[PDB]
Design a protein around this ligand. Structure first.
Ligand SMILES: CCc1ccc2[nH]c(-c3cnnn3C)nc2c1
Length: 105
């Protein structure tokens, strides 16, 4: 299970999930709602997958956790136009994440 040294990552992820701009990223991009996603995006990532991976010990380091957070935002900017609702949400969430991360790094 999660090592206590990563509790700060657990908190950041919780805070991300609570943000209104997080709605596109809470669960895996859902083929019932979004077509052609995995055709383009080879490494999907979302906050629920991160939350479960973190809790079960699937992140050894904060670097691995942050890499998955950045994958959420990188995938979003690959798939979505910057002026789309989901594209804008991704940029909000990247800034929110980086601002919390930079309190530690
Ligand atoms: C469950 C509600 C919902 C509906 C549409 C969505 N679209 C995206 C998304 C994420 N990254 N790219 N897209 C297009 N998340 C969504 C969530």
């Amino acid at each position: 299970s999660m090592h206590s040294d990563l509790t700060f990552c657990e908190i950041i992820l919780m805070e991300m999930e609570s943000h209104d701009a997080a709605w596109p990223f809470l669960e895996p991009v859902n083929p019932r709602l979004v077509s052609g996603y995995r055709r383009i995006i080879k490494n999907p990532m979302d906050f629920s997958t991160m939350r479960h991976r973190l809790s079960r010990g699937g992140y050894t380091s904060s670097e691995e956790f942050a890499a998955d957070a950045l994958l959420v935002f990188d995938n979003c900017q690959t798939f979505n136009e910057d002026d789309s609702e989901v594209g804008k949400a991704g940029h909000i969430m990247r800034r929110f994440f980086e601002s919390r991360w930079e309190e530690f790094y």
